[PDB]
């Protein structure tokens, strides 16, 4: 879907730990492209979990390392 991505920008652009805004893509990675270390990534997935109001399992959260991986993950979950 596309409605999820427009909400994804609403939090990553607001995140203060991004190296530079507008660096977000449809498949950008938090570590390689966006310059996020380990815990900053833990926080980003937690902010997405709040937006879709769905709790994310720790194993599922480890799988999520890219903007696309989150967009794919939220669609599979029924709650949104």
């Amino acid at each position: 879907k596309v409605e999820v991505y427009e909400r994804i920008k609403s939090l990553l652009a607001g995140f203060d730990k991004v190296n530079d805004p507008n660096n977000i893509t449809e498949t950008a990675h938090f570590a390689n492209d966006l310059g996020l270390d380990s815990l900053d990534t833990v926080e980003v997935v937690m902010a997405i979990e709040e937006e879709f109001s769905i709790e994310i399992p720790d194993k599922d959260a480890d799988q999520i390392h890219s903007v696309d991986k989150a967009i794919e993950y939220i669609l599979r979950q029924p709650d949104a």
């Binding site: 380990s38 815990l39 833990v42 926080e43 937690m46 979990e49 720790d58 959260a61 480890d62």
Partner: protein, 122 residues
């Protein structure tokens, strides 16, 4: 789990890969609980301010390279987490964790040599 609400059986980590998962799992539970912690102890700070404190606590021990020491820190984190999410702590205990709420301030050490000297060792 079985003994009481947030009880975690004490186990060693098998390897550094195992330890890292627990540390990230522990951080995830902590910053997730930050909204509840605010309203449960009526903390006069935003969840942003509380969540920053969580990261700094995890950053004091970021440089640990010893597996046994990590197991000790993980056990402490679970014990603190349980006694917080269960309403076992009181507002005085959690508020004391925020160093700003001491009447002598948070910068409780001298900024440099000459300020501490002029006041008398801080």
């Amino acid at each position: 789990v079985q003994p009481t609400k947030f009880a975690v059986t004490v186990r060693q980590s098998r390897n550094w890969a195992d330890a890292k998962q627990r540390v990230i799992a522990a951080y995830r539970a902590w910053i997730r609980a930050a909204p509840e912690i605010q309203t449960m102890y009526s903390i006069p700070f935003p969840v942003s301010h509380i969540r920053t404190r969580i990261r700094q606590e995890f950053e004091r021990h970021r440089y640990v390279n010893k597996l046994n020491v990590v197991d000790v820190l993980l056990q402490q984190s679970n014990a603190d987490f349980q006694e917080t999410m269960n309403f076992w702590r009181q507002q005085s205990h959690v508020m004391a964790f925020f160093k700003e709420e001491h009447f002598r301030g948070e910068k409780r050490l001298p900024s440099n040599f000459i300020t501490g000297f002029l006041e008398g060792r801080n």
